[PDB]
Amino acid sequence: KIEEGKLVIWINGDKGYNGLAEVGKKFEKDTGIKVTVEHPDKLEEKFPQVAATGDGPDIIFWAHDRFGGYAQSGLLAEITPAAAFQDKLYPFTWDAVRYNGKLIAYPIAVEALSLIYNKDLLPNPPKTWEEIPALDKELKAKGKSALMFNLQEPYFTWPLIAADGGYAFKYAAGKYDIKDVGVDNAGAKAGLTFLVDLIKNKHMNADTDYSIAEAAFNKGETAMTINGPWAWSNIDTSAVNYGVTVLPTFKGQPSKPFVGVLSAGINAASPNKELAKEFLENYLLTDEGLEAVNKDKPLGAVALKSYEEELAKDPRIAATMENAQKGEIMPNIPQMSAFWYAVRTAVINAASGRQTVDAALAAAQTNAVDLHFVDQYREQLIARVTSVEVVLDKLHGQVLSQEQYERVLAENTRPSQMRKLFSLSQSWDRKCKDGLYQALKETHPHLIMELWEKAAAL
């Protein structure tokens, strides 16, 4: 369980965890309470997996979009700031952490993607996405390339999908309509078609991930990348002469990045809730706390009015906000986790040529709207299904091909095997998903029964 009388903190590894650790050191200096900051892999999934059991960190950091799901699952303590403290942060940041009438986290900072460009390679950044292929051709002659960014996380491709009309869930009458999804409309298709064409014409490579794109930009090999405030620290170290600016337009319309509010929630199973509150309100969310984190990795536009004003002159922060204003705040509904995984699979499949754009998005759309049991509880099943071989043999023939069977089996741990199986099946139709559910239920009926029950408990 969770050790009492101390703080364990989880934050993503792309954030200023060293800076946060300093705030932890100051807290220890003034209170005697030791603070431990960790940045585990696959944090957005690890948390609900271990927290559902009743363990995990006292405090979890992520963008606000995942917190609605955490709250619905009972993993988060209710946050009760007094009025004077609440007034120290922007109202729209509190709005991002409000779920079903209550505050479920502390907002820290507002993030949005921008175009980052090498001024020595590219004195004026391109206005449009459409002119990048011509740009890449010029640069290739100098042994360079126009653009590299993470193509493994749909967050980075989202601004282009949304530009001409794609959207996640429709918002109307103060509610998100969970049945109105805009992943396979004409606009989403046009944007992703443009991305795929960049890859087909070798302006980009489908295998490019975060580390690969960062290395290429920071070594001066590519003229542009797409990234958030957290990335500026490494670019500074590399002393690249860079600018941060508005994303290119597509079909004459702005790219629309999703806006995230980095937020901190308190584990509902934590016996250290009061301590967590003190650390967050009186140590982190102060000019001195935020500055320490921000000097490690930039936070963007912080939620704290006083420090936001001090930093607002930074043209890079201005550029972040300009992009944010063209985009949309992410929904925090519990459906977000399944939505992101479906879209992630669609972008990866279309980029790798495993599916056409139309088929990739049509499948994502169907699965986000229909929310099958195996998609809703994918994360729990990955962590809790243990008889993988039994499931594979039930599916072999009917649902799984010989090759897919072999691919799943080849993974090293049970969760890696399960994760592969759900990835492969992600684009399958309802009937195949039903076959997958049936095999899981025959193999582990108590687990499946437990999942049905807890859904109803919450």
Ligand X SMILES: OC[C@H]1O[C@H](O[C@H]2[C@H](O)[C@@H](O)[C@@H](O)O[C@@H]2CO)[C@H](O)[C@@H](O)[C@@H]1O
Q: How many residues does the chain have?
A: 458
Count of residues near ligand X by CB under 6 A: 13
Count the helices and strands in the chain (H runs, E runs). 23, 15
Inter-residue contact 242 to 117 (CB < 8 Å): yes
What is the smallest separation between the CB atom of 258 and ligand X, expressed in angstroms? 7
Among 111, 184, 214, 296, binds ligand X (CB under 6 A): 111
Q: With respect to ligand X, which residue has the nearer C-beta, 68 or 435? A: 68
Name residues contacting ligand X, limited to 259-318 (CB under 6 A): 260
Stretch near ligand X under the rule CB under 6 A, chosen from 35-43, 152-160, 290-298, 300-308? 152-160
Q: Which stretch binds ligand X (CB under 6 A): 81-89, 153-161, 189-197, 286-294?
A: 153-161
Closest to 151 (Cα-Cα) out of 17, 401, 348: 348
User: Closest separation between CB of residue 388 and ligand X, Å?
Assistant: 25
| Least distance CB 405 / ligand X (angstroms) | 28
Task: Give the range of 149-157, 174-182, 359-367, 447-455 binding ligand X by CB under 6 A.
Answer: 149-157
What is the bridge-based pairing of β-strands 242-245 and 114-118?
A: antiparallel
Task: Identify which of residues 154 and 159 has a Cβ nearer to ligand X in the complex.
Answer: 154
> Per-residue DSSP letters for 244-306?
EEPPPBBTTB---PEEEEEEEEEBTT-S-HHHHHHHIIIIISSHHHHHHHHHHS--SEESBHH
Task: Please answer whether residues 232 and 217 qualify as being in contact, where contact means their C-beta atoms are separated by less than 8 angstroms.
Answer: no
**Minimum Å distance from CB 274 to ligand X?**
28
Distances (CA, A) of 352 to 199, 265, 281, 339, 347: 9, 36, 45, 20, 8
Could you tell me the maximum CA-CA distance found in the chain, to the nearest angstrom? 63
Site for ligand X in 168-227 (CB under 6 A): none
Strands 145-147 and 102-103: unpaired
**Contacts with ligand X, 60-89, as mask; x by CB under 6 A:** ---x-xx-----------------------
Q: How far is the CB of 235 from ligand X (least distance, A)?
A: 16
Q: Which of 14, 278, 322, 411 binds ligand X (CB under 6 A)?
A: 14
Instruction: List the interface residues with ligand X, window 36-55 (CB under 6 A).
Output: 44
End-to-end CA distance of the chain: 22
Positions that interact with ligand X (CB under 6 A):
12, 14, 44, 63, 65-66, 111, 153-155, 228, 260, 340
